[PDB]
Each structure stands twice: as C-alpha cells, then as structure tokens.
Write a protein that binds this ligand. Sequence first.
Ligand code: NAG
Ligand code: NAG
Ligand code: NAG
Ligand code: NAG
Ligand code: NAG
Lengths: 102, 173, 173, 173, 51
Amino acid sequence: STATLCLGHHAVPNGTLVKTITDDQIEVTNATELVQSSSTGKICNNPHRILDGIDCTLIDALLGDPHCDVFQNETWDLFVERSKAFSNCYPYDVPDYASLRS
Amino acid sequence: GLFGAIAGFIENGWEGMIDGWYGFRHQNSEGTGQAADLKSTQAAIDQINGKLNRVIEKTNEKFHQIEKEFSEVEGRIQDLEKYVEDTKIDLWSYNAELLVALENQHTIDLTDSEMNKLFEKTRRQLRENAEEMGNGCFKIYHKCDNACIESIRNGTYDHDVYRDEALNNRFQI
Amino acid sequence: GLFGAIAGFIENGWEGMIDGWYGFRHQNSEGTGQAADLKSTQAAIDQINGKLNRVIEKTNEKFHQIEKEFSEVEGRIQDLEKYVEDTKIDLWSYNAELLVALENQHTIDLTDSEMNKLFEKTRRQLRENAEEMGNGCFKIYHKCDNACIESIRNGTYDHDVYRDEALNNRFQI
Amino acid sequence: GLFGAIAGFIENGWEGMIDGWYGFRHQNSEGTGQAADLKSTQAAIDQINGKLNRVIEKTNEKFHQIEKEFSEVEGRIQDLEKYVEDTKIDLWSYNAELLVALENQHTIDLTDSEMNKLFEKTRRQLRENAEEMGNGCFKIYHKCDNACIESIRNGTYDHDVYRDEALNNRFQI
Amino acid sequence: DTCISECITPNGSIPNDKPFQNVNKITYGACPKYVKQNTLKLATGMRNVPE
Ligand SMILES: *[C@@H]1O[C@H](CO)[C@@H](O)[C@H](O)[C@H]1NC(C)=O
Ligand SMILES: *[C@@H]1O[C@H](CO)[C@@H](O)[C@H](O)[C@H]1NC(C)=O
Ligand SMILES: *[C@@H]1O[C@H](CO)[C@@H](O)[C@H](O)[C@H]1NC(C)=O
Ligand SMILES: *[C@@H]1O[C@H](CO)[C@@H](O)[C@H](O)[C@H]1NC(C)=O
Ligand SMILES: *[C@@H]1O[C@H](CO)[C@@H](O)[C@H](O)[C@H]1NC(C)=O
C-alpha cells in the first residue's frame, strides 16, 4: 500500500565554526586554514642560494674588512646579515649606506 | 541557506551517512535502508574543490623589495616607506577577510542548493504516486519493495507502472 | 530577486502590516484578518543585522603617517608621496563601492528568499487541502474558521483532519 | 546554477530559438510551434546590461604621476618607487580577477533563475489542468488548440474553463 | 638548515601551501601574502546540523 522515501544529507559530531557574510560563527562539517602562521625557525639552503654572512655585514664584505675576506667574489640569491655582525677595521661611514647596501 | 532544505525543511543531518554527502532513507514492506547519492554528492564536491583551487592558487613571488624594519630614526623617507607597507597590509587584510566571508556564504547556499535539487528531481520522478510529508520525505502511495526504491534512487522509476494503484490509495482509497 | 516572490508572484506589499516583515491575510467564514509572522520576520532581520555588524565594524586607527597637503613644490619625493595616497584612496573607494553593491544585491535576494520560504512551508502544511491561486494565496478547500487559520499560522494544522472534506470539494465537489 | 533549470532539468537549449532567450515549444492537435518569451528574455537582458554598465564605467584619468621605468640604478628612493607601483598593479590585478569571477557566477545563476521563474509561473497558470513531465514540459490534460496555447503564453489562460475536462482525463479518464 | 623551501622570512622558512601568512611582512621567494589575521578558515563543507 505505502512506502516512505526520505531525502537527506550528512552531519559530523564535531564541526568547525566559520565566518560568512551574515554570521560571525556558523558551524560547518569541514574547513581548511588559509593563513600560514608558523615557521620552523630555520632558513633552507634550497632552492635559493643563501650566503650566510656570519659576522659580516654586506658592506664590510664589499670593502674588504680583514675578517670578511672569506667572502671574496661570493654570489648569492639571498645574503643573510646577522644582528651581531661587526666591523674590525678602519673606522668608516657611508653617506647613503641604505642605497649602497640595496 | 537561500533554499530552505539544509537546517531548513530537513530537520537535521545524518551522522551515520558516511558514504556520500546527500542521500536517501526508505522504509517499505521489506524493511529500512540507506544509500548515498553519488551524483549530487560529487556536484557539491566538484564545485567546492573548484573554488578551493582558485583561492589557494599561485603565490606572490617577490625578491628584492624595500626595508620594513628600521634601527635608526630618519623621518620623511622612512615615514613614507612604512606607510606604503602599512596601507598595503591593510588592503590585503581586507581582501582576505571579505574573500573568505563571500566564499563561505556561497559554499553554504550552494550545498543547500544541491540538497534542494535532489529533492525536486526525486519529486518530479514520483509524479502523482506520492505526496510530500513536508520533512524531506515523500509518502509513496503504492507497494514499493526494494527494487522499486532502487529505481527511484537510480532514476529509472516509471510512474505509469504504479499510477492507478497510487491514485487509488491517494484519493480516498 | 533570484526567487520571484517579492516584486514577483506577490503583486505588491502591504503598507498596512506594521507588526512584522512577512505575514498572512485570510478570508474565511468569520471574516478577514491579518497577522505578521514573527519567525520569518526575525530571520531576515537577524541576517541583515549580521552583515550590518560585519560592515560597520572596527575602525582604521592610524596616528603619525605622512603629509598629504603641501605648500611648496619639491618634485620627486613629493610626487611619490601624493601618488601613494592617491592610489590608496582609489583602492579603498572601489572596495567601498563594490562592497555596498554586493551586500545590497544579497539583502534583496535574501529577503526575497525568506518570503519564498514562508510560502513553501505554508504550502507543505496544507497538503492536498488547498491549491495555489498563483498570487501568493492558497485556496483552502474546506471550512476553516479562525482557529483553523491560527493553526496554519502557528504550524499545528493537521491536514488529515480535513482531507476528505478538502478532497471532495476540490475534485468536482 | 543554483536553480537547476539550465543545464539542469531542461536537458539542453534550443539552437533554433533566435527570437528570444527563453521560450515555449508546444505540440497540440493542430501541430507544433515555437515562440520566444519577450518578458523573461528582457529581464535577463536588463540585469546583465545593468552590471555591464557598472563594470565598464568611468575611467581612471590620471595626469602627472611618478616614474615607472628607470635608466640608472639609484637604490632607496627608486626601490620604494617601484614597490609602490608593483604592489598597486598587484592589488588591481586581484580586484579585476575576483570581480570577473563573481559577476560570471552571478550571471549564470541569474539567468538560471529567470528560466526557473518562467517555469513556476507557467506552472501556476495551468493549475490542476496539467502535470510536469520533469523535463521542463507540462502535459496539458485537455484539448488545447493554438488559441489555447497562446493564452498560456500571453498569461490569460483561465483554468476553470477546462478544469473538469482536465481533471477527468487526469484522474483515471 | 639543509632543507627545501621557496619562501624565506626572518623567522625561518614557511610553507607556501596556503595563500596567506601571518609570520613576517618581510619575505623573499614565492610566498603567501602577509595579512594581519592569524586564522581564516575557508568552509570546504556544507552546514553541519547534527542529530
Ligand atoms: C576537509 O576538507 C579539506 C579540504 O578539502 C580536506 O583536506 C579534508 O579531507 C576534509 N576533511 C575531512 C574529514 O574529510
Ligand atoms: C534501478 O533499479 C532497478 C531495480 O534494482 C534495476 O533493474 C535498474 O537497472 C537500476 N538502474 C541502475 C542504473 O542502477
Ligand atoms: C494554533 O492554533 C490553535 C487554534 O487557535 C491553538 O489551539 C494552538 O495551540 C495554536 N498553537 C500555537 C503554538 O499558538
Ligand atoms: C492570449 O491568447 C488569446 C488566443 O489567441 C487572445 O484572444 C488573447 O487576447 C491573448 N492575449 C494577449 C495579451 O496577447
Ligand atoms: C616573527 O618574527 C617577528 C620578529 O622577527 C615576531 O614579532 C613575530 O611574532 C614572529 N612570528 C612567528 C610565527 O614567530
């Protein structure tokens, strides 16, 4: 005589709140994170040629401060200057250090 | 959402349906069963994966730019340099926010739409042989064993084959 | 909008309905009356107030920036300073424009959607006891006094209780 | 799109209908014919031309700005000048991309909506005198010559005038 | 470190699988645009109405 047919959709025990145009937080069955918020703390030597500046800034390696001569004729994709890099030669100053360095 | 099926006329979802997104549940003479509808389930999936690709597409890729952190105070140029970056971050932070709110709204309506389309289609198959109970379930006014349900589910149900039986039970027995 | 109810199959609105956004008007044996549907009315309101909050949210908040008005002509830096602000204002002026056009379109469709949902739901309650006159009004084919209308309005109307009466009048009396 | 009519329950389109966007095809006693519905066709057109105007509206219009091509290397200022333009082009290139993707999605749904509205309206005219074959075609259960079809098409078809005839053929002849 | 990454920031390398990042506005390579938000979940599913 009769039969019942019911249409429906899935649900998960624990969903994920998301934001939409009209709702601050609305629960959905799944979501993906769009914002990368963490790093390992290490810089990778591949695929970009990274030159570790050790105790030298680019300028002192450019001019030739004795302790930076280890960087003669070097090439890089990204030069990494350290906060504690120091000069140990004749006191100098560069008018427009920013642009020379750039 | 815009449609009314999901979190609408379909009271709630089935925590148990783990084989598809949208599905059917029947209760005939032989008993009760459940089956996911692979077709509508894949329409929602395809569309969602489609926006996913658009969104997480191909990266900025910048090399030498301008300085963003300063150790000494210099005034004028440094002021402008910082403002340039600041107003930039601000504009990209808005874009990201809005983009995510629009997409989310659409993903909901879209998935609400695929539910409501499964319903109308299934509704259009049953012709005069059924009535809608108003909860997403159709009352089929004729004997419908499992092979009968399967034909509805697989889209081959012929309504003439049960019309008169249906009509009879429907209209005052 | 996308639905067809508002400024669509519902010829026009009721200047008189001042107690809700969506509502009912009946005409039975006892007479005529009107009543707002607080439920759908609040769904539209909630959603609209929801975007309103998102939009008029929390302010820029900038302090020392860069100069935007100049008394002397200087060239190069001043050129760049002005261009930076100009291209900024331009990008924010587009965002504001588009944002307001998208929201407005959505607010219309959304409110058109809540009308059309009130209709389908009410339609699904009446079962076989009514027909749609095509103007947003259902012709109820059975005696329906005020307590009968109230049950439709409050969602408790049982269709079996009037089915045969309904069916009879419907199908050639 | 969101509706299901276009590239949905209406199997495909008519390469032959060159007089309108949406239309009708009937088959009665007198034969077969075709006619575009100028009303729904113009609703889609108006809306599309409406966004078209918004989009291709009024131009940037900039005069003296800043330099974007450089012959000598200078550092700091030149760095910032280039970054300013670069981040600008990037932000406008996103806007253009997104704008075109949103509009396109909407144009589809909107035109899918006007199809589905033509259907429901025509469906609401036929009252109990027809059934939906599930392919966008209504089976009219009564003699309907050309002047009868024309009245449906032009919105003047009275269903009472054929109800009993209709009802009879419908319900077991 | 001896690893592989195309996106470098003062803080270390970060994967560029996502389109946005909130690690540092200073980056070199193929990198996620920087934004102020620490999270932005994109809904990859339908609404969840549990039983
Ligand atoms: C959630 O969606 C993401 C993106 O499509 C996917 O990685 C994952 O499989 C989904 N989660 C589940 C539980 O399926
Ligand atoms: C639909 O159901 C019937 C009953 O089981 C079967 O014979 C028919 O071939 C099915 N069609 C498909 C495509 O599965
Ligand atoms: C609905 O209508 C009937 C008639 O007035 C009444 O008895 C019933 O309790 C009403 N329900 C609600 C929730 O108001
Ligand atoms: C609709 O169809 C009938 C039959 O041809 C005709 O008399 C009637 O006036 C038509 N109305 C319009 C507006 O064309
Ligand atoms: C990255 O570095 C800056 C300082 O270099 C710090 O303020 C920020 O919170 C750091 N982000 C992460 C994820 O460590």
